């Protein structure tokens, strides 16, 4: 059974940083991309970026709204995903989803249940 598991989220002081975990199982991790999608309360889903598969050498891409702030990398030995957030605003206060991704379907086929991050003093 495919499983995605986000964690590490809590409350963060503004200007600060938190690291997110994505743990998976039930498929061959390295063949797929992994994306991070977030959602602020009552707003739309916003893609943040992805990290490519083995074929692509596990390279990285981001959206313009977090490029330079956020950092994606992967634990292929453990099939774990990570997101490094920095210089955090309340506009980063949200639920963070890791999603299986790639060029097979060019869509995000499996998601976790998410993690909440709340930025506040």
């Amino acid at each position: 059974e495919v499983k995605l598991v986000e964690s590490g989220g809590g409350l963060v002081q503004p200007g600060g940083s938190l690291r997110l975990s994505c743990a998976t199982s039930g498929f061959t991790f390295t063949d797929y991309y992994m994306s991070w999608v977030r959602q602020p309360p009552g707003k739309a889903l916003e893609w943040l970026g992805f990290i490519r598969n083995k074929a692509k050498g596990y390279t990285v891409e981001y959206s313009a709204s977090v490029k330079g702030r956020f950092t994606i990398s992967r634990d292929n030995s453990q099939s774990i995903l990570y997101l490094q957030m920095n210089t955090l605003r309340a506009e980063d206060s949200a639920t963070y989803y890791c999603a299986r991704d790639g060029y097979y379907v060019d869509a995000m086929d499996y998601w976790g249940q998410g993690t909440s991050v709340t930025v506040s003093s």
């Binding site: 994306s35 739309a44 916003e46 893609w47 959206s63 991704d101 869509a107 995000m108």
Partner: protein, 112 residues
């Protein structure tokens, strides 16, 4: 900045009625090589994680009911729910994967 614009913002049908929803793109998500459109529809029940419904504009993701029909190509796409189920109460996102990924704003489906 490829931008997908979803209308309506929301809509409220009864169970069994026939719902359609549109997705206008900034740019033609039509890839010439493989001759497909790079669009996908997701379902997000309230308080839950998203869930892929349809990719390449019209292909139903495994397990997805005949009800859900994706249609369109280029910069125009739609989602039809033939005979709505109570199960269907959610927000529906389109998302372009032509260049990186970009989520639409969503259509909030109500059920009377």
């Amino acid at each position: 900045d490829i931008v997908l614009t979803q209308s309506p913002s929301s809509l409220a049908v009864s169970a069994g009625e026939r719902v359609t929803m549109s997705c206008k793109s900034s740019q033609s998500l039509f890839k010439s090589r493989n001759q497909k459109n790079y669009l996908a529809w997701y379902q997000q029940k309230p308080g839950q994680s998203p869930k892929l419904l349809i990719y390449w504009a019209s292909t139903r993701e495994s397990g997805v009911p005949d009800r859900f029909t994706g249609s369109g190509s280029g910069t125009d796409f739609t989602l039809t729910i033939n005979g709505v189920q109570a199960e269907d109460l959610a927000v529906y996102y389109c998302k372009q994967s032509y260049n990186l990924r970009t989520f639409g704003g969503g259509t909030k489906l109500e059920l009377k």
